[PDB]
Amino acid sequence: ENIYNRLGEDLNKWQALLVQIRKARGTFDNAETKKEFGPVVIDYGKVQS
Amino acid sequence: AWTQVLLPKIKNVVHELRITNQV
């Protein structure tokens, strides 16, 4: 409801954040399971689904 | 011989099924 009120009657309804959400699907929805970085590996295994 | 192998060292070809944006 907060989002709806904030963006009620946007370009049509949102038309913008419905676009940036698709980009936000990054760091996510990829065959990669654990992001390695040097000797530090952050594993999104439990949250992936 | 290669054919009857298909049906000679053959490489194993593999490909996968995945899903993206729920497709």
Side-chain angles (χ1 to χ4, degrees):
Chain A
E1 173 73 11
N2 190 5
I3 291 276
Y4 301 164
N5 299 140
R6 287 184 184 178
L7 277 297
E9 191 62 27
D10 207 4
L11 296 94
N12 195 339
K13 189 44 185 184
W14 293 271
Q15 182 54 256
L17 65 92
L18 192 142
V19 192
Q20 293 87 19
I21 288 302
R22 178 165 267 276
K23 296 183 290 294
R25 264 177 56 197
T27 76
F28 172 75
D29 202 1
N30 52 2
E32 281 270 43
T33 66
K34 51 150 184 54
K35 179 250 177 175
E36 181 269 353
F37 182 76
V40 171
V41 287
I42 171 170
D43 189 359
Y44 46 102
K46 306 318 169 72
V47 299
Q48 175 63 261
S49 163
Chain B
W2 192 95
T3 304
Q4 67 91 23
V5 160
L6 266 292
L7 210 56
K9 207 273 168 183
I10 183 168
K11 195 261 179 186
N12 187 6
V13 63
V14 59
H15 71 269
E16 68 191 7
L17 309 167
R18 73 180 69 188
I19 186 166
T20 181
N21 60 62
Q22 202 54 227
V23 166

Coordinates of all heavy atoms in Angstrom, one line a residue:
Chain A
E1 N 0.8 -1.2 0.0 CA 0.0 0.0 0.0 C 0.9 1.3 0.0 O 0.5 2.3 -0.6 CB -0.9 0.0 1.2 CG -1.7 1.3 1.4 CD -2.8 1.5 0.4 OE1 -3.1 0.5 -0.4 OE2 -3.4 2.6 0.3
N2 N 2.0 1.2 0.7 CA 2.9 2.4 0.7 C 3.4 2.7 -0.7 O 3.3 3.8 -1.2 CB 4.1 2.1 1.6 CG 4.9 3.3 1.8 OD1 4.6 4.4 1.4 ND2 6.0 3.2 2.5
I3 N 3.8 1.7 -1.4 CA 4.3 1.9 -2.8 C 3.1 2.4 -3.7 O 3.3 3.3 -4.5 CB 4.8 0.5 -3.4 CG1 6.1 0.2 -2.7 CG2 5.0 0.7 -4.9 CD1 7.3 0.8 -3.3
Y4 N 2.0 1.8 -3.5 CA 0.8 2.2 -4.3 C 0.5 3.6 -4.1 O 0.3 4.4 -5.1 CB -0.4 1.3 -4.0 CG -0.1 -0.2 -4.2 CD1 -1.0 -1.1 -3.6 CD2 0.9 -0.7 -4.9 CE1 -0.8 -2.5 -3.7 CE2 1.2 -2.0 -5.1 CZ 0.3 -2.9 -4.5 OH 0.5 -4.2 -4.6
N5 N 0.4 4.1 -2.9 CA 0.2 5.5 -2.6 C 1.3 6.4 -3.1 O 1.0 7.4 -3.7 CB 0.0 5.7 -1.1 CG -1.2 4.9 -0.5 OD1 -1.1 4.3 0.6 ND2 -2.3 4.8 -1.3
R6 N 2.5 6.0 -2.9 CA 3.6 6.8 -3.4 C 3.6 7.0 -4.9 O 3.9 8.1 -5.4 CB 5.0 6.2 -3.0 CG 5.3 6.3 -1.5 CD 6.6 5.7 -1.2 NE 6.9 5.7 0.2 CZ 8.0 5.3 0.8 NH1 9.0 4.8 0.1 NH2 8.1 5.3 2.1
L7 N 3.2 6.0 -5.6 CA 3.2 6.0 -7.1 C 1.9 5.9 -7.7 O 1.8 5.5 -8.9 CB 4.2 5.0 -7.7 CG 5.7 5.3 -7.7 CD1 6.0 6.4 -8.6 CD2 6.3 5.5 -6.3
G8 N 0.8 6.1 -7.0 CA -0.5 6.1 -7.6 C -0.6 7.0 -8.8 O -0.2 8.2 -8.7
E9 N -1.0 6.6 -10.0 CA -1.1 7.4 -11.2 C 0.3 8.0 -11.6 O 0.4 9.2 -11.7 CB -2.2 8.5 -11.0 CG -2.5 9.2 -12.3 CD -3.1 8.3 -13.3 OE1 -3.7 7.3 -12.9 OE2 -3.0 8.6 -14.5
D10 N 1.2 7.1 -11.8 CA 2.5 7.5 -12.3 C 2.4 7.6 -13.8 O 1.3 7.8 -14.3 CB 3.6 6.5 -12.0 CG 5.0 7.2 -11.9 OD1 5.0 8.4 -12.1 OD2 6.0 6.5 -11.7
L11 N 3.5 7.5 -14.6 CA 3.5 7.6 -16.0 C 2.3 6.9 -16.6 O 1.6 7.5 -17.5 CB 4.8 7.0 -16.5 CG 6.2 7.7 -16.2 CD1 6.7 7.0 -14.9 CD2 7.1 7.6 -17.3
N12 N 2.1 5.7 -16.3 CA 0.7 5.2 -16.1 C 0.4 4.8 -14.7 O -0.5 5.4 -14.0 CB 0.3 4.1 -17.1 CG -1.2 3.9 -17.2 OD1 -1.9 4.2 -16.4 ND2 -1.6 3.2 -18.3
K13 N 1.0 3.8 -14.2 CA 0.9 3.4 -12.8 C 2.2 3.3 -12.0 O 2.3 3.9 -10.9 CB 0.2 2.0 -12.7 CG -0.2 1.6 -11.3 CD -0.8 2.7 -10.4 CE -1.0 2.2 -9.0 NZ -1.7 3.2 -8.2
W14 N 3.2 2.6 -12.5 CA 4.6 2.9 -12.1 C 5.5 3.3 -13.3 O 6.1 4.4 -13.3 CB 5.1 1.7 -11.3 CG 4.4 1.5 -10.1 CD1 4.7 2.0 -8.9 CD2 3.3 0.6 -9.9 NE1 3.8 1.6 -7.9 CE2 2.9 0.7 -8.5 CE3 2.5 -0.2 -10.7 CZ2 1.9 0.0 -8.0 CZ3 1.5 -0.9 -10.2 CH2 1.2 -0.8 -8.8
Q15 N 5.6 2.4 -14.2 CA 6.3 2.6 -15.5 C 7.8 2.9 -15.3 O 8.5 2.9 -16.3 CB 5.6 3.7 -16.2 CG 6.1 4.0 -17.6 CD 6.2 2.8 -18.5 OE1 7.2 2.2 -18.7 NE2 5.0 2.4 -19.0
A16 N 8.2 3.1 -14.1 CA 9.6 3.3 -13.8 C 10.2 2.2 -12.9 O 11.1 1.5 -13.3 CB 9.9 4.7 -13.2
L17 N 9.7 2.1 -11.7 CA 10.3 1.1 -10.8 C 10.0 -0.3 -11.3 O 10.8 -1.2 -11.0 CB 9.8 1.3 -9.4 CG 8.3 1.1 -9.0 CD1 8.1 -0.4 -8.6 CD2 7.9 2.0 -7.9
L18 N 8.9 -0.5 -12.0 CA 8.7 -1.8 -12.7 C 9.8 -2.0 -13.7 O 10.0 -3.1 -14.2 CB 7.3 -1.8 -13.3 CG 6.9 -3.2 -13.8 CD1 5.4 -3.4 -13.5 CD2 7.1 -3.3 -15.3
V19 N 10.6 -1.0 -14.1 CA 11.7 -1.2 -15.0 C 13.0 -1.4 -14.1 O 13.8 -2.3 -14.4 CB 11.9 0.0 -15.9 CG1 12.9 -0.4 -17.0 CG2 10.6 0.3 -16.6
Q20 N 13.2 -0.6 -13.1 CA 14.4 -0.8 -12.3 C 14.4 -2.1 -11.5 O 15.5 -2.6 -11.2 CB 14.8 0.3 -11.4 CG 15.1 1.7 -12.1 CD 13.9 2.5 -12.4 OE1 12.9 2.3 -11.8 NE2 14.0 3.4 -13.3
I21 N 13.2 -2.7 -11.3 CA 13.2 -4.0 -10.6 C 13.8 -5.0 -11.4 O 14.6 -5.9 -10.9 CB 11.7 -4.3 -10.2 CG1 11.2 -3.4 -9.1 CG2 11.6 -5.8 -9.8 CD1 12.1 -3.5 -7.8
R22 N 13.5 -5.0 -12.7 CA 14.1 -6.0 -13.6 C 15.6 -5.9 -13.5 O 16.3 -7.0 -13.5 CB 13.7 -5.7 -15.1 CG 14.3 -6.7 -16.1 CD 13.6 -6.7 -17.4 NE 12.6 -7.7 -17.5 CZ 12.8 -9.0 -17.8 NH1 14.0 -9.4 -18.1 NH2 11.8 -9.8 -17.9
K23 N 16.2 -4.8 -13.5 CA 17.7 -4.7 -13.3 C 18.1 -5.1 -11.9 O 19.1 -5.7 -11.8 CB 18.1 -3.2 -13.6 CG 17.9 -2.7 -15.0 CD 18.5 -1.3 -15.1 CE 17.7 -0.3 -14.4 NZ 16.3 -0.2 -15.0
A24 N 17.2 -4.9 -10.9 CA 17.5 -5.3 -9.6 C 17.5 -6.8 -9.5 O 18.1 -7.4 -8.5 CB 16.5 -4.8 -8.6
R25 N 16.9 -7.5 -10.5 CA 17.1 -9.0 -10.5 C 18.5 -9.4 -10.7 O 18.8 -10.6 -10.7 CB 16.2 -9.6 -11.6 CG 14.9 -10.1 -11.2 CD 14.1 -10.6 -12.4 NE 14.9 -11.6 -13.1 CZ 14.7 -12.0 -14.3 NH1 13.7 -11.4 -15.0 NH2 15.4 -13.0 -14.8
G26 N 19.5 -8.5 -10.8 CA 20.9 -8.9 -10.8 C 21.3 -9.4 -9.4 O 20.5 -9.3 -8.4
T27 N 22.5 -9.8 -9.3 CA 23.1 -10.4 -8.1 C 22.2 -11.5 -7.6 O 22.0 -11.8 -6.4 CB 23.2 -9.3 -7.0 OG1 21.9 -9.1 -6.4 CG2 23.8 -8.1 -7.5
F28 N 21.6 -12.2 -8.6 CA 20.4 -13.0 -8.4 C 19.9 -13.6 -9.7 O 20.3 -13.1 -10.8 CB 19.3 -12.2 -7.7 CG 18.0 -12.8 -7.6 CD1 17.8 -13.8 -6.6 CD2 17.0 -12.5 -8.4 CE1 16.6 -14.4 -6.5 CE2 15.8 -13.1 -8.3 CZ 15.6 -14.0 -7.4
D29 N 19.2 -14.6 -9.7 CA 18.6 -15.3 -10.9 C 19.7 -15.6 -11.9 O 19.6 -15.4 -13.1 CB 17.6 -14.4 -11.5 CG 16.6 -15.2 -12.4 OD1 16.8 -16.4 -12.5 OD2 15.7 -14.6 -13.0
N30 N 20.8 -16.1 -11.4 CA 22.0 -16.5 -12.2 C 22.4 -17.9 -11.7 O 22.3 -18.3 -10.6 CB 23.1 -15.5 -12.1 CG 23.5 -15.1 -10.7 OD1 22.9 -15.7 -9.7 ND2 24.4 -14.2 -10.5
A31 N 23.1 -18.6 -12.7 CA 23.6 -20.0 -12.3 C 24.6 -19.9 -11.3 O 24.9 -20.9 -10.6 CB 24.1 -20.6 -13.6
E32 N 25.3 -18.8 -11.1 CA 26.2 -18.6 -10.0 C 25.5 -18.8 -8.7 O 24.4 -18.3 -8.5 CB 26.9 -17.2 -10.1 CG 28.0 -17.1 -11.1 CD 29.4 -17.5 -10.5 OE1 29.4 -18.5 -9.7 OE2 30.3 -16.8 -10.8
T33 N 26.1 -19.6 -7.8 CA 25.6 -19.8 -6.5 C 26.3 -19.1 -5.3 O 25.7 -18.7 -4.4 CB 25.6 -21.4 -6.2 OG1 26.9 -21.8 -6.1 CG2 24.9 -22.1 -7.3
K34 N 27.6 -19.1 -5.4 CA 28.4 -18.4 -4.4 C 29.3 -17.3 -5.1 O 30.1 -17.7 -6.0 CB 29.3 -19.3 -3.6 CG 30.1 -20.3 -4.5 CD 31.4 -20.7 -3.8 CE 32.2 -21.6 -4.6 NZ 32.5 -20.9 -6.0
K35 N 29.2 -16.1 -4.8 CA 30.0 -15.1 -5.3 C 31.4 -15.1 -4.7 O 31.5 -14.9 -3.5 CB 29.4 -13.7 -5.2 CG 30.3 -12.6 -5.8 CD 30.9 -11.7 -4.6 CE 31.9 -10.7 -5.1 NZ 32.3 -9.8 -4.0
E36 N 32.4 -15.6 -5.4 CA 33.8 -15.5 -4.9 C 34.3 -14.1 -5.1 O 33.8 -13.3 -6.0 CB 34.6 -16.5 -5.7 CG 36.1 -16.5 -5.3 CD 36.9 -15.5 -6.1 OE1 36.4 -14.9 -7.1 OE2 38.1 -15.4 -5.8
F37 N 35.2 -13.7 -4.3 CA 35.9 -12.4 -4.4 C 37.2 -12.5 -3.6 O 37.2 -12.4 -2.4 CB 35.1 -11.2 -3.9 CG 35.8 -9.9 -4.1 CD1 35.8 -9.4 -5.3 CD2 36.4 -9.4 -3.0 CE1 36.5 -8.2 -5.5 CE2 37.1 -8.2 -3.2 CZ 37.1 -7.6 -4.5
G38 N 38.3 -12.7 -4.4 CA 39.6 -13.0 -3.7 C 39.5 -14.2 -2.9 O 38.9 -15.2 -3.2
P39 N 40.0 -14.1 -1.6 CA 39.9 -15.3 -0.7 C 38.6 -15.2 0.1 O 38.4 -16.0 1.1 CB 41.1 -15.1 0.2 CG 41.4 -13.7 0.2 CD 41.0 -13.1 -1.1
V40 N 37.7 -14.3 -0.2 CA 36.4 -14.2 0.5 C 35.3 -14.6 -0.4 O 35.0 -14.0 -1.5 CB 36.2 -12.7 1.0 CG1 34.8 -12.6 1.5 CG2 37.2 -12.3 2.0
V41 N 34.6 -15.7 0.0 CA 33.5 -16.2 -0.8 C 32.2 -16.0 0.0 O 32.0 -16.6 1.1 CB 33.7 -17.7 -1.2 CG1 34.8 -17.8 -2.2 CG2 34.1 -18.5 0.0
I42 N 31.3 -15.3 -0.6 CA 30.0 -15.1 0.0 C 29.0 -16.0 -0.7 O 28.7 -15.8 -1.9 CB 29.5 -13.6 0.0 CG1 28.1 -13.5 0.5 CG2 29.8 -13.0 -1.3 CD1 27.6 -12.1 0.7
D43 N 28.4 -16.9 0.0 CA 27.6 -18.0 -0.6 C 26.1 -17.7 -0.3 O 25.7 -17.8 0.8 CB 28.0 -19.3 -0.1 CG 27.3 -20.5 -0.9 OD1 26.5 -20.2 -1.8 OD2 27.6 -21.6 -0.5
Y44 N 25.4 -17.4 -1.4 CA 23.9 -17.2 -1.3 C 23.3 -18.6 -1.7 O 22.6 -18.7 -2.7 CB 23.4 -16.1 -2.2 CG 24.0 -16.1 -3.6 CD1 23.3 -16.6 -4.7 CD2 25.4 -15.7 -3.8 CE1 23.9 -16.6 -5.9 CE2 25.9 -15.8 -5.0 CZ 25.2 -16.2 -6.1 OH 25.7 -16.3 -7.3
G45 N 23.5 -19.6 -0.8 CA 22.9 -20.9 -1.1 C 21.6 -21.1 -0.5 O 20.6 -21.6 -1.1
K46 N 21.4 -20.7 0.7 CA 20.2 -20.9 1.5 C 19.1 -19.9 1.0 O 17.9 -20.3 1.0 CB 20.4 -20.7 3.0 CG 21.5 -21.5 3.5 CD 21.5 -23.0 3.0 CE 22.7 -23.7 3.4 NZ 22.7 -24.1 4.8
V47 N 19.5 -18.7 0.5 CA 18.5 -17.7 0.1 C 18.1 -17.8 -1.4 O 17.1 -17.2 -1.8 CB 19.0 -16.3 0.4 CG1 19.2 -16.2 1.9 CG2 20.3 -16.1 -0.3
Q48 N 18.9 -18.6 -2.2 CA 18.8 -18.5 -3.6 C 17.4 -18.7 -4.1 O 16.8 -18.0 -4.9 CB 19.7 -19.5 -4.2 CG 19.6 -19.6 -5.7 CD 19.9 -18.4 -6.4 OE1 19.1 -17.5 -6.7 NE2 21.2 -18.2 -6.6
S49 N 16.7 -19.7 -3.5 CA 15.3 -20.0 -3.8 C 14.3 -19.2 -2.9 O 13.3 -18.8 -3.4 CB 15.0 -21.5 -3.6 OG 13.6 -21.7 -3.6
Chain B
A1 N 33.2 -47.1 -38.1 CA 33.4 -47.3 -36.6 C 33.0 -46.1 -35.8 O 32.3 -46.3 -34.8 CB 34.9 -47.6 -36.4
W2 N 33.3 -44.9 -36.3 CA 32.8 -43.7 -35.7 C 31.3 -43.7 -35.6 O 30.7 -43.3 -34.5 CB 33.4 -42.5 -36.4 CG 33.2 -41.2 -35.8 CD1 34.2 -40.6 -35.0 CD2 32.1 -40.3 -35.8 NE1 33.7 -39.4 -34.6 CE2 32.4 -39.2 -35.1 CE3 30.8 -40.4 -36.4 CZ2 31.5 -38.2 -34.9 CZ3 30.0 -39.4 -36.2 CH2 30.3 -38.3 -35.5
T3 N 30.7 -44.1 -36.7 CA 29.2 -44.1 -36.7 C 28.6 -45.0 -35.7 O 27.8 -44.7 -34.9 CB 28.7 -44.4 -38.1 OG1 29.3 -43.5 -39.1 CG2 27.2 -44.3 -38.2
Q4 N 29.1 -46.3 -35.7 CA 28.5 -47.3 -34.8 C 28.8 -46.9 -33.4 O 28.1 -47.3 -32.5 CB 29.1 -48.7 -35.1 CG 30.5 -48.8 -34.9 CD 30.8 -49.3 -33.5 OE1 29.9 -49.9 -32.8 NE2 32.0 -49.1 -33.0
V5 N 29.9 -46.1 -33.2 CA 30.1 -45.5 -31.9 C 29.0 -44.5 -31.5 O 28.5 -44.6 -30.4 CB 31.5 -44.8 -31.8 CG1 31.6 -43.8 -30.7 CG2 32.6 -45.8 -31.6
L6 N 28.7 -43.7 -32.5 CA 27.5 -42.8 -32.3 C 26.3 -43.5 -32.0 O 25.5 -43.2 -31.2 CB 27.4 -41.9 -33.5 CG 28.1 -40.5 -33.4 CD1 27.4 -39.7 -32.3 CD2 29.5 -40.7 -33.1
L7 N 26.0 -44.6 -32.8 CA 24.8 -45.4 -32.6 C 24.9 -46.3 -31.4 O 24.9 -45.8 -30.3 CB 24.6 -46.2 -33.9 CG 23.1 -46.5 -34.3 CD1 22.4 -45.2 -34.4 CD2 23.1 -47.3 -35.6
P8 N 38.0 -45.5 -31.9 CA 37.5 -44.2 -32.2 C 37.1 -43.5 -30.9 O 36.2 -43.9 -30.2 CB 36.3 -44.4 -33.1 CG 36.5 -45.6 -33.8 CD 37.2 -46.5 -32.8
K9 N 37.9 -42.4 -30.6 CA 37.7 -41.6 -29.4 C 36.7 -40.5 -29.6 O 37.1 -39.5 -30.3 CB 39.0 -41.2 -28.8 CG 39.1 -41.0 -27.3 CD 38.6 -39.6 -26.9 CE 38.3 -39.5 -25.4 NZ 37.8 -38.2 -25.0
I10 N 35.5 -40.6 -29.1 CA 34.5 -39.5 -29.2 C 34.6 -38.7 -28.0 O 34.6 -39.2 -26.8 CB 33.1 -40.1 -29.5 CG1 32.1 -39.0 -29.7 CG2 32.7 -41.1 -28.3 CD1 30.8 -39.4 -30.2
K11 N 34.6 -37.4 -28.1 CA 34.4 -36.5 -27.0 C 33.0 -36.5 -26.5 O 32.0 -36.6 -27.3 CB 34.8 -35.0 -27.4 CG 35.1 -34.1 -26.2 CD 33.9 -33.3 -25.9 CE 34.1 -32.4 -24.7 NZ 32.8 -31.6 -24.4
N12 N 32.8 -36.3 -25.2 CA 31.5 -36.3 -24.6 C 30.9 -34.9 -24.7 O 31.5 -34.0 -24.0 CB 31.5 -36.8 -23.2 CG 30.1 -36.9 -22.6 OD1 29.1 -36.7 -23.3 ND2 30.0 -37.2 -21.3
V13 N 29.9 -34.7 -25.4 CA 29.2 -33.4 -25.5 C 28.1 -33.3 -24.5 O 27.3 -34.3 -24.3 CB 28.6 -33.1 -26.9 CG1 27.6 -34.1 -27.3 CG2 28.1 -31.7 -27.0
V14 N 27.9 -32.2 -23.8 CA 26.9 -32.1 -22.8 C 26.3 -30.7 -22.9 O 27.1 -29.7 -23.1 CB 27.5 -32.4 -21.4 CG1 28.6 -31.4 -21.1 CG2 26.4 -32.2 -20.3
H15 N 25.0 -30.5 -22.6 CA 24.4 -29.2 -22.5 C 23.3 -29.4 -21.4 O 22.8 -30.5 -21.2 CB 23.8 -28.7 -23.8 CG 22.6 -29.5 -24.3 ND1 22.7 -30.5 -25.1 CD2 21.3 -29.3 -24.0 CE1 21.5 -31.0 -25.4 NE2 20.6 -30.2 -24.7
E16 N 22.9 -28.3 -20.9 CA 22.0 -28.3 -19.7 C 20.7 -27.5 -20.0 O 20.6 -26.8 -21.0 CB 22.7 -27.6 -18.5 CG 22.9 -26.1 -18.6 CD 23.8 -25.6 -17.5 OE1 24.3 -26.4 -16.7 OE2 23.9 -24.4 -17.5
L17 N 19.7 -27.8 -19.2 CA 18.5 -27.0 -19.2 C 18.5 -26.2 -17.9 O 18.8 -26.7 -16.8 CB 17.2 -27.9 -19.1 CG 17.1 -29.0 -20.2 CD1 16.0 -30.0 -19.8 CD2 16.9 -28.5 -21.5
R18 N 18.3 -24.9 -18.1 CA 18.2 -24.0 -17.0 C 16.9 -23.2 -17.1 O 16.1 -23.4 -18.0 CB 19.4 -23.0 -16.8 CG 19.5 -21.9 -17.9 CD 20.7 -21.1 -17.7 NE 21.9 -21.8 -17.9 CZ 23.1 -21.4 -17.7 NH1 23.3 -20.2 -17.2 NH2 24.2 -22.1 -18.0
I19 N 16.7 -22.2 -16.2 CA 15.5 -21.4 -16.2 C 15.9 -20.0 -15.8 O 16.7 -19.8 -14.9 CB 14.4 -21.9 -15.3 CG1 13.1 -21.1 -15.4 CG2 14.9 -22.0 -13.8 CD1 11.9 -21.8 -14.7
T20 N 15.4 -19.0 -16.6 CA 15.7 -17.6 -16.3 C 14.4 -16.8 -16.5 O 13.6 -17.1 -17.3 CB 16.8 -17.0 -17.2 OG1 17.0 -15.7 -16.8 CG2 16.4 -17.1 -18.7
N21 N 14.2 -15.8 -15.6 CA 13.0 -15.1 -15.4 C 11.7 -15.9 -15.5 O 10.7 -15.5 -15.9 CB 12.9 -14.0 -16.5 CG 12.9 -14.5 -17.9 OD1 12.0 -15.2 -18.3 ND2 13.9 -14.1 -18.6
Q22 N 11.9 -17.2 -15.0 CA 10.8 -18.2 -15.0 C 10.5 -18.6 -16.5 O 9.3 -18.5 -16.9 CB 9.6 -17.7 -14.3 CG 8.7 -18.8 -13.8 CD 9.4 -19.9 -13.0 OE1 9.2 -21.1 -13.2 NE2 10.1 -19.4 -12.0
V23 N 11.5 -19.0 -17.2 CA 11.3 -19.5 -18.6 C 12.4 -20.6 -18.7 O 13.5 -20.4 -18.4 CB 11.5 -18.5 -19.7 CG1 11.7 -19.2 -21.0 CG2 10.4 -17.5 -19.7

